[PDB]
């Protein structure tokens, strides 16, 4: 999640998800891509 002031990341390993990081990096992320 990223709303105009932060980049939030939620995770949970086996239910609800807890916040993990709150980077204040403000950028204009538009696309998503992962690497194997």
């Amino acid at each position: 999640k990223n709303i105009d002031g932060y980049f939030k990341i939620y995770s949970k390993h086996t239910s609800a998800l807890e916040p993990l990081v709150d980077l204040p990096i403000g950028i204009n992320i538009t696309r998503f891509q992962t690497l194997l």
Binding site: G5, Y6, P24, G26
Partner: protein, 49 residues
């Protein structure tokens, strides 16, 4: 220049440091410094962040 310890008062090396401030559309993670003790069982005023 060739500085020597036998010069006068105006011909000596001086180290000058300049600090510039910047404020743009970005979160401010650099602030300045003030914490007191804790009291209980009394009607007082508190401030927790």
């Amino acid at each position: 220049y060739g500085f020597r310890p036998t010069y006068g008062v105006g011909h000596q090396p001086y180290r000058v440091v300049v600090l510039s401030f910047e404020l743009l559309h970005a979160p401010a993670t650099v602030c300045g410094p003030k914490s007191t003790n804790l009291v209980k069982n009394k009607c007082v005023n508190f401030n927790f962040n």
